[PDB]
C-alpha cells in the first residue's frame, strides 16, 4: 500500500555504477590477503598438535 | 590356411559396470591425491625428526589417528579402495561399497573427477590375425614387441596377410633382413628394413622368399584419453601388487602381464569403447593403491 | 524420484503404502529390454557409443503380461524409478497399493511359483549398486512371507554370499523391526560431493544422474516439504510422529 | 507388362512410436526456440565484442556456465535432442531418454507443441508406377524433377499408364515434344507441351508415337501440416548434418537424399497419416539440431 | 578402358593469394554488416515516409551524404569491395587496393574476422573418374544431382569403377532399377534401389547387366567451415551478379554455374585445402556485394 | 623491422643509405626455395597444411653468388625483412650501403645484363601485395636508370599491366619527384586498437603477422639495447 519509489538515477553515470564497481573490486584485495596470511601462518607454525 | 593371433587379445572378460558415476570418479581421484600426500609425508618426516607430518596425513586419509599398537592399514579408505578395484575387473565381483560411504570419502578433497582431459601412449602391439599358406609356419611371440617368425618351405614365394586391427594409430615394422610389404591391390615396393603403417588403411601382404627364416619386429602406439593425474609407471606397479595381493582372483576372468596388455585387449573387443572408460578408472585406482600400500604394507 | 529419495525402511515402506500400483506401470511403449544398441554421447566421443539396454532403467520397456512381469515392474520402479509396459491390467489391481500387491492375499495374483534366481537375472543384479540390491531384497522378503516360502528366501541368500551380508534385517509382520533398522537405501539425495551437469556414458548412469539433478531442483522447489520451518502447517496424518504405524504389522 | 517406379518411394521403413505425446512435443518446441536464441546471441556477441550474450544464452540452453578447457556441446539438452532424433527415424532405435529429463527440459520456455498450426509445400514427384507395353522402354530418373524417358520401338503407337498416387495435390507435366495425354476412357486432346493434372482424377494414358524418344518432366506440389516455426531451409541442413554425423546409421533402414523425399515416402505408405505426424516432429527437431550445431561447432577437418 | 569425369571438376584455376590476412578479413565482415544495415534502412525509410534512416546508413557506408543530382555508387567502400572480389577469383587479377584503405574501412565497425566458427553444407557431387570397359558407354550429367547413364552392348556383365574422391562426407546413390554395388574385395549384395556410401573407403564397383540402360542418380554433402554470418541464399545471388557484372572476366580462368560448384572444384585440386579459406572469404564478400548492389543499383 | 616500418619513398631511400649490405644478407643456410611442403597449422586443421617455400617468405634461403643472387637478396630484404645466404660476399661489398649497390658505379659490381622478368618470376611477384610490388619496382627503376636501361624497364612494365598501374611515380635522378611522392609503402606499423595473437595459414602471412605483432615491442625497447652495442664501436 505504502510502496516508496526508488529513483537511483544519480547513482549511474551513463551505464556505470561507480559505488558498486568499486565495492566489488575490494574483494580482490581481500582474496590476496587471505592467501598471504594463510601461507605465512603455515610456514611459521607448521603442523599443529594439541 | 593357418591363422595365428596374439595370445593376450583372446577372450576379453567383461569389466564391471559399477563405480563409474561422477561421485565414484571423484572418490578415486581423492584417493590418488591423498595417497600422494601420504608418500610425501615420509620425506617431510625426514627433514625434521618428528612424525607429525605422517600422523597428520594418515588422519586425513584414514579418519583415525595412527597407533603404535596395531599395524597401520588405512582405515575406511583402504577397504573402499580395495573393494572398488575388485568390482572394476569383473562383472561377477560384488559391489560391496555403499554409495553413501563413497560420497563421504569424496568430500575429503576438492578434486574434480574428469577422466578425459589428457592422453597416454600404450605400446602393446595388436595382431588380430596373421594368415599364411599351407607350407609356411608362422609364430607370433610377445606383446610389447611382437616377434613374428615365418619360414617358407614350399617351392615358390608365399604371401602372408597381416591384420593389425582398426584401433592402433601407428605400427612400425622392422625385419631381420629386407622384405617387401604392400597394402592389398597396391604394387610391391623394393625391399626395405623398416615400414611405417597406419592400421586403418587395410590388410598388408608380405612376400616370403624361400630360404632362411624372416623375423619381423612390430611396435605399436595407441592414444587413450586419461586423467591428467595419470602416471603410467605408478599404474603398472599397482597392477602387479593387485595381482599379487589377490584382488583379481575371481572365477571366469583372464589374466594379463601388464596394464598395457589389459587395456588394449579390452579395446579390441566387440564393444571395446565402453570398456576403456572403466579400465582407465581402474588404472587411476591402481595408481592410488600402489602409493598407499607402499606407505602402509600389510 | 520420490521413491529413490527414501532413506530409511520406515520411509520406503510408508511410501509403498500410499503409492498405487499404477505408478509402477508406465503406459508407454518403450523398446525391447535386452538389445545391443549404438547411442550418441557427443560430449566424450564422436563415434557412437555401444551399450546394452536393460530392464533397470529410467525408461519404459516391454514387459511380459504374466505375474512375473508385474513383480519385475514393481522392483524396477523401486530401484530405477520407472516401471514397464504391461498392457490391460484390471482396474482393481491398479488401484491397490504396491505393498498390498507384495504382502496381501486379497489380490488375485498367484506368486507361489516365483523363482528368485530367474528374477534376479532378468532384473540384472550384476549391474545394480549396493543400495539397489538392498531394495530388491526387501521386495523378495515381502513376497516370501506372504507366500510362506521363507525357506526359499534363505536358500537363495545362501547361494549368494554378498547378498546375504547386505540383506536388510526386518520381519515383514512386526513394526518394531522396521523402526530399529539403520540401513540407508537412498539412491538419490543431497550430494556431499560436487555434482555437475555433465552427461554420463552408460544408459543407467546417465538416467540416474538425471534423477539426481532433478531431485536437487525438487529439493529447492516449493513442492519440497521443510519440517523445521513448516511443521505446524502439516496435516496430523502426515506429520512425523514416533508412534506412526503401518496398517496391520 | 513392364512396371517402373520411383526409387525413393520403395519400401519406407517404419518410424518411431515414442516421444509423440504432448509433453515430448513441448520439449522439441522449446529446443528449437532456445537454439534460435543461441545463433542470434552468437552473432550479437561478435558485433559487440563481448561473450556475455552468448554465455547468457548458453546458460539457458545447457544449465551450466562453461569452463575454458571443457568443450561446449550443449549439455543435457543436446544429449536428449540427439537421441530423440534417432528414436523418430526408426523403430529399431533404442529410445533411452527418461521422462523426467523431457519434463524438465520442456519447462524452460513457455511454448506450445502445436504441429498443426500451418502448412508447407513439399516438391517431390511421386510416381507410384508407370505401366508400359512390351516393345516400349521407360526409365524414371530424379525426385525433385522426375524425367521419364520413354522410347517406342514397337510397330504402332503405344499407351503408357501413369499412376501418381493420391496424396499429391498438383502435378505439372512437360515434354520435349508436344504429346497426347488424357484420363482413362476419355477422348485424346490435341498435342500440347504442358498439362496440369489432379493426381486424384485417375490413371493417365500417354500416347507414344514411333520414332524419337519422348521425355516427360514432372513436378509435384504436396501440402503437409507443419508448425508455424517450420523452416524448410533449416530442416534440410539439419537432415544433412544428422546423416553426416552418423545419427541415422541403424540396421534395416532406408536412406533418403532429402527430408522432402523422406516425408513424401512415408506419406505414400499404409498408415501414412500417422507416420507423417511423427515425421513432422522429426523435422522441427532436425531444425533445432542444425541451429545448435552451427553455433557450437565440434568437428574439425 | 574409358574414363568419364565431372565437367565442373576439370582444371580448377588458381585463386588469388591477397587480402586473406586478419585485417582484410575484418574488412569483409565490416562490409557485410554495413551492407545489411543499408538494406534494412531502406525498408525503414519506405515504411516511415522519411529519408532520415537511409541518410544515416548511406553516410556511414560511403562517407558522404546522398544527393539528388549525384548517383549512389556506394563510395570508396563500393570500389574496394569490387576490387577485392576480382582479386579473390584469379591470381592474375591486379589487386590494386592498398592496405591503408583496407585498415581504414575495417575500423568502421567492430567485428572479428573469424572464418571458422561455423560450417555450411554444399550439395555438389564430386565424381573424379568412372572407369568403364569396352562396349560400355558412361555419361555423367549434372553437378547438384549427377545422373550416370550406362549401358553395355557386350555378351557378359561388366564392372564399372566409381571414384568419389576423399573430400565428400556422404554420398547417397539411387538407381532407376535395383542394382548391386560393393567395395573393392567385398562380396556383392542383393540388388537394391539406394546406397549410402562414405567416399573415403575406397573405390566402388557396380555390376552392369546386359539389357536396358541403368541410370544412377548421385547426391553428396560436404561440410566446410564458414563464418557465422554466411548465408547460402545471399552468396549464390551475389555470385550470379558478379558474373553478370564482369567482375570475373579474367583471362585463363574457368567459370561455374553456382558457388557450390566453385568451392568443390577448388577443394579437389592437388592441394585443395589451400583454396578453401580464400573461397570462403570470397563467398562472404559476394554476400556483401549482393546486399549493397540491391540497395544501390547501377 | 625498421625497413618494413618505413611508409614513404623518402624514408625508404634514407634508410637504404644508412644500412650496410651486411643487414640485407644473412648467415643462416636455411632451405632450398620452390619446394612443396606440408606445415603444421593446428589452429585450424588436424591435417598438415600444404604450401610452397619462396624467396619472399621472410626466412633465409640459399642463394647463388652471382649478381642476380645479390640483387634478389636485397629485394627480399626490402619486401620481407630478411635476406638470403650468399656465401663469402667479401668485406668490400659488405661495407657499402644498399643504395650504392643499387645506384652507384663505384661498387665494382656489373649489374647490367639483368632480366627483370626472370628476377620477378624468381621473387614470386604474383604472390606479393601492392606495397611489396611497389617496393620491388622501386629497386628495378634504380637499377635500370643507373645502367642506362630505362627502355628495358618500360618494356617490362608494358608486358605486365597490373604492375604498370601501381608503378612508382619518381625519377631516380630528380630530387623533386622524391619529395612530392605520395606513395604508402609501410608493410608494418602501430595499429589502432590491436591485432589478435593468432596464426595464419600461409608462410608469408604468418611471418608477416609476426613482424606486425612484434613491432610495438620493438619500437619501445630498441633504443637502449642498440645503443649499448653501438657505443665504443666504428660503423661499417
- DSSP characters for chain C? -TTTT--SHHHHHHHHHHSBGGGTB--S--B-SS-EEEE--TTT-SSPEEEE--SSSSS-BB--SSHHHHHHHHHHHHHHS--BB-----HHHHHSBHHHHHH-SSS----TT--HHHHHHHTTSSS--HHHHHHHHHHHHHHHHHHT-HHHHHHHHHH-HHHHHH-----TT-HHHHHH------SS---SS---S---SSHHHHHHHHHHHHHHHHHSSTTS--HHHHGGGS-TTTS--TT---S--
| Inter-residue contact E231 to E287 (CB < 8 Å) | yes
Radius of gyration of chain B (CA): 24
* Whole-number Å distance between alpha carbons of F105 and F89: 18
- The torsion of the CA quartet C118, C121, C122, C123, rounded to 10 degrees, works out to 120
* Whole-number Å distance between alpha carbons of C186 and B99: 9
User: By 3-state DSSP, what share of chain E in percent is helix, strand and coil, each rounded to 5?
Assistant: 35, 25, 40
Any chain B CB within 8 A of the CB of E200?
A: no
Whether residue E273 and residue D142 make contact (CB cut-off 8 A), yes or no, is: no
* H or E segment and range at residue B103: helix B99-106
Buried b (16+ CB within 10 A) or exposed e, F153-166: beebbeebebbeeb
Q: Which residues of B are less than 8 Å from C192 in CB distance?
A: 103-104, 106-107
Q: Looking at the complex, report in whole angstroms how far the Cα of residue E221 sits from the nearest Cα belonging to chain D.
A: 7
Q: Which residues of E are less than 8 Å from F193 in CB distance?
A: 107
Specify the DSSP class assigned to residue E228.
Answer: T
Q: Looking at the complex, report in whole angstroms how far the Cα of residue C14 sits from the nearest Cα belonging to chain D.
A: 23
Q: Which residue of F has its CA nearest to D300?
A: F45
CB neighbours of residue D107 within 10 Å: 13
Any chain F CB within 8 A of the CB of D297?
A: no
Whether residue F184 and residue E98 make contact (CB cut-off 8 A), yes or no, is: yes
CB neighbours of residue D228 within 10 Å: 10
* Whole-number Å distance between alpha carbons of E191 and E177: 9
Any chain E CB within 8 A of the CB of B184?
A: yes
Long-range residue pairs from D105-108, CB within 8 A, at least 24 positions apart, any chain: D105/D27, D105/D30, D105/D31, D105/D76, D105/D77, D105/D80, D106/D23, D106/D24, D106/D26, D106/D27, D106/D30, D108/D30, D108/D34, D108/D60
Question: How far is residue B49 from each of residues B43, B54, B58, E176, measured CA to CA in Å?
Answer: 11, 11, 17, 89
Q: Looking at the complex, report in whole angstroms how far the Cα of residue B200 sits from the nearest Cα belonging to chain E.
A: 10
C-alpha cell at position B228: 591428467
| Inter-residue contact F154 to F81 (CB < 8 Å) | no
In this structure, the strands spanning E136-141 and E146-152 are: antiparallel
How many alpha carbons fall within 13 Å on the CB side of residue D206? 30
Q: Looking at the complex, report in whole angstroms how far the Cα of residue E163 sits from the nearest Cα belonging to chain D.
A: 19
C-alpha cell at position C13: 515402506
Q: Using CB atoms, list chains with 3+ pairs below 8 Å to chain D.
A: C, E, F
C-alpha cell at position C213: 539433478
Whether residue C44 and residue B22 make contact (CB cut-off 8 A), yes or no, is: no
Inter-chain contacts counted by CB atoms under 8 A, chains C and D: 86
CB neighbours of residue D188 within 10 Å: 12
Q: Looking at the complex, report in whole angstroms how far the Cα of residue D257 sits from the nearest Cα belonging to chain C.
A: 22
* Residue partners of D53: CB distance under 8 A and separation at least 6: D41, D42, D44, D45
Radius of gyration of chain A (CA): 21
DSSP SS3 for B221: strand
* Residue partners of D134: CB distance under 8 A and separation at least 6: D1, D2, D154
Whether residue D42 and residue E117 make contact (CB cut-off 8 A), yes or no, is: yes
C-alpha cell at position D246: 552418423
Q: Which residues of E are less than 8 Å from D245 in CB distance?
A: none
Q: Which residues of B are less than 8 Å from C191 in CB distance?
A: 23, 103
Mutate to test the interface with B, among A42, A43, A46, A47 (most CBs of B within 10 A): A47
Q: Using CB atoms, list chains with 3+ pairs below 8 Å to chain E.
A: B, D, F
Mutate to test the interface with B, among E161, E183, E185 (most CBs of B within 10 A): E185
Grid cell 513392364 is found at D2
C-alpha cell at position E153: 552392348
Specify the DSSP class assigned to residue B205.
Answer: E
* Whole-number Å distance between alpha carbons of D32 and D40: 13
Whether residue C58 and residue D98 make contact (CB cut-off 8 A), yes or no, is: yes
* Whole-number Å distance between alpha carbons of B235 and B226: 12
Q: Do chains B and A touch (3 or more CB pairs under 8 A)?
A: yes
CB neighbours of residue C165 within 10 Å: 10
Q: Using CB atoms, list chains with 3+ pairs below 8 Å to chain B.
A: A, C, E
The number of helices, as runs of H, and strands, as runs of E, in chain A is 1, 2
C-alpha cell at position B179: 622384405
Whether residue C50 and residue B96 make contact (CB cut-off 8 A), yes or no, is: no
Closest CA to D100 of D29, D33, D27: D27
Q: Which residue of A has its CA nearest to B56?
A: A47
| Inter-residue contact D159 to D153 (CB < 8 Å) | no
Closest CA to E108 of E33, E51, E39, E56: E33
Q: Looking at the complex, report in whole angstroms how far the Cα of residue F168 sits from the nearest Cα belonging to chain E.
A: 13
The number of helices, as runs of H, and strands, as runs of E, in chain B is 7, 11
Helical residues (DSSP H) of D49-120, grouped into ranges: 52-62, 75-89, 99-106
- The torsion of the CA quartet E102, E107, E109, E112, rounded to 10 degrees, works out to 70
C-alpha cell at position B109: 578433497
Specify the DSSP class assigned to residue F122.
Answer: H
Q: Which residues of D are less than 8 Å from F47 in CB distance?
A: 301
Experimental technique used to determine this entry: cryo-EM
Any chain E CB within 8 A of the CB of D1?
A: no
| Inter-residue contact C52 to C35 (CB < 8 Å) | yes
Q: Which residue of D has its CA nearest to F41?
A: D301
Q: Do chains F and A touch (3 or more CB pairs under 8 A)?
A: no
- B232-245 vs B272-295: helix crossing angle, rounded to 10: 80
Mutate to test the interface with C, among B29, B80, B84, B98 (most CBs of C within 10 A): B98
Mutate to test the interface with A, among B52, B54, B58, B59 (most CBs of A within 10 A): B52
Whether residue E176 and residue D7 make contact (CB cut-off 8 A), yes or no, is: yes
CB neighbours of residue F220 within 10 Å: 9
Mutate to test the interface with F, among E24, E86, E98 (most CBs of F within 10 A): E98
Q: Looking at the complex, report in whole angstroms how far the Cα of residue C78 sits from the nearest Cα belonging to chain D.
A: 15
Q: Looking at the complex, report in whole angstroms how far the Cα of residue B52 sits from the nearest Cα belonging to chain C.
A: 28
Whether residue C204 and residue B17 make contact (CB cut-off 8 A), yes or no, is: yes
DSSP SS3 for E94: coil
DSSP strand E in D114-256: where? 118-122, 129-132, 136-141, 146-152, 158-163, 170-183, 192-197, 204-208, 214-226
* Whole-number Å distance between alpha carbons of C203 and C209: 10
Question: How far is residue C231 from each of residues C8, C224, C245, F49, F127, measured CA to CA in Å?
Answer: 20, 13, 19, 70, 82
CB neighbours of residue B291 within 10 Å: 24
Q: Using CB atoms, list chains with 3+ pairs below 8 Å to chain C.
A: B, D
Whether residue C194 and residue B20 make contact (CB cut-off 8 A), yes or no, is: no
Amino acid at each position: 500500500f505504502a510502496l516508496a519509489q526508488i529513483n537511483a538515477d544519480d547513482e549511474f553515470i551513463g551505464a556505470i555504477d561507480k559505488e558498486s564497481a568499486e565495492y566489488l573490486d575490494e574483494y580482490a584485495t581481500l582474496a590476496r590477503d587471505i592467501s598471504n596470511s594463510l601461507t605465512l601462518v603455515k610456514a611459521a607454525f607448521g603442523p599443529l598438535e594439541r | 590356411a593357418n591363422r595365428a593371433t596374439s595370445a593376450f587379445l583372446d577372450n576379453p572378460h567383461p569389466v564391471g559396470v559399477n563405480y563409474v558415476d561422477e561421485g565414484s570418479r571423484q572418490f578415486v581421484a581423492v584417493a590418488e591425491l591423498l595417497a600422494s600426500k601420504l608418500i610425501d609425508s615420509s620425506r617431510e618426516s625426514d627433514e625434521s625428526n618428528s612424525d607429525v607430518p605422517f600422523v597428520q596425513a594418515y588422519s586425513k586419509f584414514a579418519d583415525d589417528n595412527p597407533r603404535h599398537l596395531r599395524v597401520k592399514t588405512g582405515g575406511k579408505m583402504a577397504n573402499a579402495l580395495t573393494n572398488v578395484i575388485r568390482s572394476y575387473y569383473s562383472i561377477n565381483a560384488p559391489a560391496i561399497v555403499p554409495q553413501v560411504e563413497i560420497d563421504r570419502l569424496a568430500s575429503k578433497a576438492t578434486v574434480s573427477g574428469d577422466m578425459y582431459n589428457s592422453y597416454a601412449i600404450f605400446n602393446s602391439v595388436p595382431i588380430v590375425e596373421v594368415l599364411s599358406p599351407a607350407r609356411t609356419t608362422v609364430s607370433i611371440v610377445g606383446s610389447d614387441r611382437a616377434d613374428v617368425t615365418m619360414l617358407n618351405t614350399g617351392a615358390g614365394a608365399a604371401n602372408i596377410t597381416f591384420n593389425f586391427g582398426q584401433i592402433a594409430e601407428t605400427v612400425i615394422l622392422k625385419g631381420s633382413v629386407p622384405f617387401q610389404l604392400a597394402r592389398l591391390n597396391q604394387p610391391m615396393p623394393a625391399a626395405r628394413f623398416t615400414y611405417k603403417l597406419r592400421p586403418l588403411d587395410g590388410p598388408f601382404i608380405v612376400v616370403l622368399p624361400v630360404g632362411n627364416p624372416l623375423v619381423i619386429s612390430a611396435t605399436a602406439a595407441t592414444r587413450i584419453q586419461v586423467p591428467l593425474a595419470f602416471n603410467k609407471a605408478l599404474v603398472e606397479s599397482g597392477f602387479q601388487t593387485a595381482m599379487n595381493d589377490g584382488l583379481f582372483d575371481i572365477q571366469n576372468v583372464n589374466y594379463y602381464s601388464s596394464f598395457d596388455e589389459f587395456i588394449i585387449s579390452q579395446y579390441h573387443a566387440q564393444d571395446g569403447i565402453n570398456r576403456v572408460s572403466t579400465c582407465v578408472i581402474l588404472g587411476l585406482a591402481l595408481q592410488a593403491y600402489d602409493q598407499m600400500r607402499r606407505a602402509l604394507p600389510v | 524420484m520420490d521413491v529413490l529419495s527414501k532413506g530409511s525402511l520406515k520411509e520406503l515402506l510408508a511410501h509403498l503404502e500410499k503409492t498405487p500400483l499404477e505408478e509402477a506401470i508406465s503406459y508407454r511403449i518403450g523398446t525391447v529390454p535386452y538389445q545391443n544398441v549404438l547411442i550418441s554421447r557427443n560430449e566424450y566421443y564422436n563415434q557412437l557409443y555401444p551399450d546394452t539396454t536393460s530392464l533397470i532403467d529410467g525408461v519404459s520397456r516391454e514387459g511380459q503380461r504374466n505375474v512375473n512381469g508385474l513383480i519385475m515392474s514393481i522392483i524396477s520402479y523401486v530401484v530405477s524409478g520407472s516401471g514397464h509396459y504391461i498392457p490391460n491390467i484390471g482396474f482393481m489391481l491398479l488401484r491397490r497399493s504396491i505393498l498390498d500387491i507384495l504382502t496381501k492375499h486379497d489380490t488375485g495374483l498367484v506368486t507361489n511359483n516365483l523363482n528368485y534366481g530367474i528374477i534376479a537375472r532378468n532384473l540384472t543384479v550384476s549391474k545394480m549398486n549396493c543400495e539397489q540390491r538392498k531394495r530388491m531384497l526387501i521386495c523378495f522378503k515381502l513376497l516370501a512371507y506372504k507366500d510362506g516360502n521363507q525357506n526359499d528366501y534363505e536358500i537363495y541368500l545362501n547361494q549368494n554370499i554378498p547378498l546375504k551380508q547386505i540383506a536388510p534385517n526386518f520381519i515383514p509382520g512386526d513394526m518394531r523391526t522396521v523402526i530399529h533398522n539403520q540401513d540407508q537405501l537412498a539412491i538419490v539425495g543431497i550430494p556431499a560431493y560436487r555434482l555437475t551437469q555433465s552427461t554420463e556414458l552408460s544408459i543407467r548412469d546417465d538416467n540416474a544422474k538425471s534423477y539426481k539433478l532433478g531431485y536437487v531442483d525438487w529439493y529447492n522447489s516449493n513442492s519440497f516439504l521443510r519440517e523445521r520451518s513448516e511443521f505446524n502447517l502439516i496435516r496430523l496424518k502426515d506429520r512425523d510422529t514416533k508412534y506412526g504405524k503401518l496398517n496391520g504389522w
